[PDB]
Design an enzyme around this catalytic site. Structure first.
Site, PDB file in Angstrom:
ATOM      1  N   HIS A 177       0.847  -1.226   0.000  1.00 62.29           N
ATOM      2  CA  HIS A 177       0.000   0.000   0.000  1.00 62.29           C
ATOM      3  C   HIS A 177       0.869   1.258   0.000  1.00 62.29           C
ATOM      4  O   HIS A 177       1.195   1.775   1.059  1.00 62.29           O
ATOM      5  CB  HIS A 177      -0.917  -0.027   1.221  1.00 62.29           C
ATOM      6  CG  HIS A 177      -1.905   1.102   1.281  1.00 62.29           C
ATOM      7  ND1 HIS A 177      -1.561   2.375   1.674  1.00 62.29           N
ATOM      8  CD2 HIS A 177      -3.245   1.120   1.096  1.00 62.29           C
ATOM      9  CE1 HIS A 177      -2.636   3.148   1.646  1.00 62.29           C
ATOM     10  NE2 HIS A 177      -3.677   2.392   1.361  1.00 62.29           N
ATOM     11  N   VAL A 196       2.864   4.066   1.969  1.00 52.13           N
ATOM     12  CA  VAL A 196       2.171   4.977   2.869  1.00 52.13           C
ATOM     13  C   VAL A 196       1.248   4.164   3.774  1.00 52.13           C
ATOM     14  O   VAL A 196       0.548   3.266   3.323  1.00 52.13           O
ATOM     15  CB  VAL A 196       1.358   6.038   2.084  1.00 52.13           C
ATOM     16  CG1 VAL A 196       0.349   5.376   1.147  1.00 52.13           C
ATOM     17  CG2 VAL A 196       0.655   6.998   3.019  1.00 52.13           C
ATOM     18  N   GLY A 253      -4.611   4.907   5.804  1.00 47.64           N
ATOM     19  CA  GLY A 253      -5.323   5.793   6.730  1.00 47.64           C
ATOM     20  C   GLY A 253      -6.357   5.045   7.544  1.00 47.64           C
ATOM     21  O   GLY A 253      -6.566   5.335   8.737  1.00 47.64           O
ATOM     22  N   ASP A 267      -8.625   2.889  12.532  1.00 48.86           N
ATOM     23  CA  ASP A 267      -8.973   1.727  13.356  1.00 48.86           C
ATOM     24  C   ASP A 267      -8.342   1.789  14.744  1.00 48.86           C
ATOM     25  O   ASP A 267      -8.968   1.392  15.728  1.00 48.86           O
ATOM     26  CB  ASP A 267      -8.574   0.388  12.721  1.00 48.86           C
ATOM     27  CG  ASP A 267      -9.405  -0.766  13.259  1.00 48.86           C
ATOM     28  OD1 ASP A 267     -10.630  -0.643  13.184  1.00 48.86           O
ATOM     29  OD2 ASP A 267      -8.884  -1.673  13.937  1.00 48.86           O
TER      30      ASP A 267
HETATM   31  N1  54F Z   1      -6.193   6.036  -2.700  1.00 42.83           N
HETATM   32  C1  54F Z   1      -6.301   5.843  -1.384  1.00 42.83           C
HETATM   33  C2  54F Z   1      -7.500   5.361  -0.882  1.00 42.83           C
HETATM   34  C3  54F Z   1      -7.588   5.080   0.477  1.00 42.83           C
HETATM   35  C4  54F Z   1      -6.521   5.373   1.327  1.00 42.83           C
HETATM   36  C5  54F Z   1      -5.374   5.994   0.853  1.00 42.83           C
HETATM   37  O1  54F Z   1      -4.284   6.108   1.701  1.00 42.83           O
HETATM   38  C6  54F Z   1      -4.125   7.152   2.567  1.00 42.83           C
HETATM   39  C7  54F Z   1      -3.108   7.037   3.503  1.00 42.83           C
HETATM   40  C8  54F Z   1      -2.765   8.122   4.306  1.00 42.83           C
HETATM   41  C9  54F Z   1      -3.467   9.309   4.207  1.00 42.83           C
HETATM   42  C10 54F Z   1      -4.518   9.395   3.285  1.00 42.83           C
HETATM   43  N2  54F Z   1      -4.753   8.342   2.420  1.00 42.83           N
HETATM   44  C11 54F Z   1      -5.248   6.154  -0.519  1.00 42.83           C
HETATM   45  N1  54F Z   2     -13.636  -2.835  18.981  1.00 48.82           N
HETATM   46  C1  54F Z   2     -13.657  -2.663  17.651  1.00 48.82           C
HETATM   47  C2  54F Z   2     -13.067  -1.539  17.092  1.00 48.82           C
HETATM   48  C3  54F Z   2     -13.048  -1.388  15.711  1.00 48.82           C
HETATM   49  C4  54F Z   2     -13.644  -2.346  14.895  1.00 48.82           C
HETATM   50  C5  54F Z   2     -14.335  -3.410  15.463  1.00 48.82           C
HETATM   51  O1  54F Z   2     -14.820  -4.406  14.649  1.00 48.82           O
HETATM   52  C6  54F Z   2     -15.959  -4.184  13.896  1.00 48.82           C
HETATM   53  C7  54F Z   2     -16.180  -5.079  12.854  1.00 48.82           C
HETATM   54  C8  54F Z   2     -17.349  -5.022  12.098  1.00 48.82           C
HETATM   55  C9  54F Z   2     -18.323  -4.094  12.427  1.00 48.82           C
HETATM   56  C10 54F Z   2     -18.058  -3.172  13.449  1.00 48.82           C
HETATM   57  N2  54F Z   2     -16.926  -3.277  14.224  1.00 48.82           N
HETATM   58  C11 54F Z   2     -14.265  -3.601  16.830  1.00 48.82           C
END
Ligand code: 54F
Ligand code: 54F
Lengths: 169, 170
Positions: free
Chosen positions: A68, A74, A77, A82
């Site tokens: 990625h 990078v 994001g 998460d």
């Molecule tokens: N094309 C694309 C789509 C999703 C995420 C992404 O990566 C990120 C990573 C860091 C900051 C912003 N975008 C790029």
């Molecule tokens: N504790 C925690 C935090 C982020 C994502 C998560 O998992 C998910 C997966 C599917 C739908 C919603 N949450 C759990």
């Protein structure tokens, strides 16, 4: 009780051994995006209702850099986002609530910078906005993600809930 | 802008910079790639009449993220289904012939109201392009939904992705 957690603590958490059976877990590698919680409290933070500060060490060989993207590494994001949800779940477990976490979503998310393979450290800053105890427990928080002292993401109104059964989720 | 469906091999080709070419939009490679196929892409229709993508990810119990997320409670990370949406907005802009590399810029509002379990068969992604913006750099705003075996489980309003002919400054 405890106001900071080591990686080994977080890994205990990932196996269910920190908060116990049926209760909040972090992911294991390779979904775990926190190395340490450097501060956690139920007071202070931007709303005076609790705060977490956590870190992830960066080096060039972390797995997500190679894929990625190819020729354009990078940190995803989504993975930094998460980390913020997982930290809000952790908070709920740390407070002593039973049940397993599920992220419920977010208000505005903004990415306005990036984590390169040359970075040294990402910092997450979570500010607990409200906790809700109505049949099920959830938290609302605002977060930021910074890299080497520079803020690069924001999320308003992160929501995470705890579930004593996810069978129906 | 003339091909309206893409296979997994087309998408792997995209991940190597070989679909749209060097300097232009890529998808992630495994294991960040969260799409198997694009079944439909167009610059018309969709909820705003300004474009649409429909994509799929096949689910089986052995996908890597189930074992670590979480131990004893396997469930596809929501963040990865959300990322798929961003990467599809990126692909759209690449598919429209714009130059530059994608960075997600965020979202207006994200909701998770269900889950993908390792017993699921298929995730579908539906992306409705709302607006394309050409103001020095190009970006797109889109709404999206993630469904699993017929059931809508996530939504996102106002997904934003931009194309960056120089990411040094980003
Ligand atoms: N094309 C694309 C789509 C999703 C995420 C992404 O990566 C990120 C990573 C860091 C900051 C912003 N975008 C790029
Ligand atoms: N504790 C925690 C935090 C982020 C994502 C998560 O998992 C998910 C997966 C599917 C739908 C919603 N949450 C759990």
């Amino acid at each position: 009780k405890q106001h900071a957690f080591t990686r080994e603590d977080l890994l205990r958490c990932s196996r269910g051994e920190l908060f116990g059976p049926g209760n909040a877990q972090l992911p294991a590698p390779n979904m775990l995006m926190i190395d340490r919680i450097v501060h956690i409290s139920d007071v202070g933070g931007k709303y005076g209702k609790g705060e977490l500060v956590a870190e992830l060490d960066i080096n060039p060989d972390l797995w997500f850099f190679a894929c990625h993207f190819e020729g354009d590494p990078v940190m995803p994001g989504c993975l930094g986002l998460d980390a913020m949800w997982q930290l809000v779940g952790f908070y709920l477990g740390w407070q002593g609530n039973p049940g397993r976490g599920r992220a419920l979503g977010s208000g505005e998310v903004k990415f306005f910078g990036q984590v390169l393979p040359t970075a040294k450290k990402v910092t997450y800053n979570i500010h607990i906005k409200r906790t809700i105890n109505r049949s099920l427990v959830l938290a609302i928080a605002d977060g930021t993600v910074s890299v080497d002292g520079r803020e690069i993401y924001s999320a308003e109104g992160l929501r995470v809930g705890l579930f004593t059964s996810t069978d129906s989720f």
